[PDB]
Amino acid sequence: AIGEFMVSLPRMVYPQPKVLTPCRKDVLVVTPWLAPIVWEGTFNIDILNEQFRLQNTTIGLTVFAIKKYVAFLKLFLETAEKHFMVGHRVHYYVFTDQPAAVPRVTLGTGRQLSVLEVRAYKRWQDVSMRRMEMISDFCERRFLSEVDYLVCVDVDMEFRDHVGVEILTPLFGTLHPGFYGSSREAFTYERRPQSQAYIPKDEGDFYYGGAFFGGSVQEVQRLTRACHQAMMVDQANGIEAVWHDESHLNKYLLRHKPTKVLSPEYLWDQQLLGWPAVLRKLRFTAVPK
């Protein structure tokens, strides 16, 4: 569980934090609303692992594999096994229209997988968007009783390096790899005032990627419910946001600030963007098309 009585940490030996030395000199490591921005060098994973293990934390990972995207599951799950929350309780939730096409991946102890059969929409845009409805529906069902945190990701990806408890917080978004260095005017927010996702050119903190968000079950339920309801209003008004669920995610996170923001280490495409000096690790990356 979360916010529960917490026992004392054991004696630990680690380097003393240096008050007069910035942990990074090249990047912003805290938002103006005092949310950590997670980069390599900002955290001691040993301290964090202790804190979260002592709370017997369970992390749910949601992934949608509809139609041809079932092909991405084998690599996704195999690499998650080597890099995602290793040492902690993990529950994978695979949403699919083809339960029989889910590969039999060998899981480490304390880790489990559930196949959730859902309907397949025709348009790739609707498949992508209706994740919000499907996540919200299963929150008020399975997730509240089974996991402490939910992490919601795209399937056409692989883990290449550590993704662990440093990301866990009531509500998080991830800096989109294409726009972390862009000015807000250049962000591809929905710009039509007729849409619920609308953000004016003088507003916005970051451009968050639709491919990687999460938080506590309660906060993820709230986010997904709000995005789905906003998308239903748009549909009733005959408008579809420029970047679909991602546009609505960005509107939500503008109005409800995330309690952590993940750096582009956590959402990357090496083929398109290379490997900049600013990224000490590439953790979760696009699969070459």
Ligand X SMILES: CCCCCCCCO[C@@H]1O[C@H](CO)[C@H](O)[C@H](O)[C@H]1O[C@@H]1O[C@@H](C)[C@@H](O)[C@@H](O)[C@@H]1O
Ligand Y SMILES: O=C(NC[C@H]1O[C@@H](n2ccc(=O)[nH]c2=O)[C@H](O)[C@@H]1O)c1cccc(CO[C@@H]2O[C@H](CO)[C@H](O)[C@H](O)[C@@H]2O)n1
| Contacting positions for a second copy (CB under 8 A) | 3, 5-6, 8-9, 11-14, 16-34, 36-38, 42-44, 47-48, 51, 166, 175, 180-181, 183-184, 200, 202-206, 222, 254-257, 260, 278
Distance between CA atoms of residues 112 and 134, nearest Å: 20
CB 188, CB 99: distance < 8 Å:
no
CB 164, CB 45: distance < 8 Å:
yes
Distances (CA, A) of 101 to 73, 79, 201: 9, 18, 44
Distance between CA atoms of residues 35 and 123, nearest Å: 36
CB 192, CB 135: distance < 8 Å:
no
Residue at 76: amino acid letter: F
Is 55 one of the binding residues for ligand Y (CB under 6 A)? no
Site string for Mn ion, 149-168 (x = CB under 5 A): -------x------------
Residue 166 among known ligand-binding residues: no
Is 178 one of the binding residues for ligand X (CB under 6 A)? yes
Burial of 27 (0-12, 13-18, 19+ CB in 10 A): middle
Distance between CA atoms of residues 87 and 47, nearest Å: 14
* Paired strand residues for 268: 285
**DSSP conformational letter for 10:** P
Is 246 one of the binding residues for ligand X (CB under 6 A)? yes
Contacting residue, 51, 58, 125, 188, with ligand X by CB under 6 A: 188
Is 166 one of the binding residues for ligand X (CB under 6 A)? no
Binding region for ligand X (CB under 6 A) out of 42-50, 79-87, 141-149, 172-180: 172-180
Residue 188 among known ligand-binding residues: yes
Is 93 one of the binding residues for ligand Y (CB under 6 A)? no
CB 156, CB 68: distance < 8 Å:
no
Distance between CA atoms of residues 48 and 69, nearest Å: 34
Q: Is 246 a catalytic residue?
A: yes
Give me the catalytic one of 158, 219, 246, 265: 246
Which residues are annotated binding-site positions? 64-66, 69, 154-156, 176, 188, 246, 269
List of residues contacting ligand Y (CB under 6 A): 64-67, 69, 124, 127-128, 154-156
List of residues contacting ligand X (CB under 6 A): 176-178, 188, 243, 246, 269, 272, 286
Catalytic residue positions?
246
List of residues contacting Mn ion (CB under 5 A): 156
